[PDB]
Amino acid sequence: YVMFKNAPTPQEFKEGEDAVIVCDVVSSLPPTIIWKHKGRDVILKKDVRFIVLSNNYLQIRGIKKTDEGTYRCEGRILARGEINFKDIQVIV
């Protein structure tokens, strides 16, 4: 299944700091979440300042004031084709 937990939508970090986007989701196990908006699928570019943690969070290194807005969490499963999501606002 997929249960969205611990995800304060409007978050806030410091300019040039190591930030993380809080978005916990209890997806089945093999699949995972997809970070969209403010980058268009970050998991496909994997810039030098984007490290998704094992708990489905997004550690943006530096978090520039121009990369803030609304990151969309997309909990997705390929075995049991599921597409859950929500808009997380990030300010910096």
Swiss-Prot record:
Polysialylated by ST8SIA2 and ST8SIA4. Polysialylation modulates cell interactions by confering both attractive and repulsive properties that are highly regulated by ST8SIA2 and ST8SIA4. Polysialylation is formed on a-2,3-linked sialic acid of core glycans. It comes from the Eukaryota. Disulfide bonds join C23-C73. Residues 1-89 form the Ig-like C2-type domain. Heparin binds at K36, H37, K38, G39, R40, K45, K46, D47, V48, R49. Interacts with MDK. Found in a complex with SLC39A6, SLC39A10 and with NCAM1; this complex controls NCAM1 phosphorylation and integration into focal adhesion complexes during epithelial-tomesenchymal transition. Interacts with synaptic plasticity regulator PANTS. This protein is a cell adhesion molecule involved in neuron-neuron adhesion, neurite fasciculation, outgrowth of neurites, etc. This is Neural cell adhesion molecule 1. It comes from Mus musculus (Mouse). The chain holds residues 117 to 208 of 1115 of the full protein.
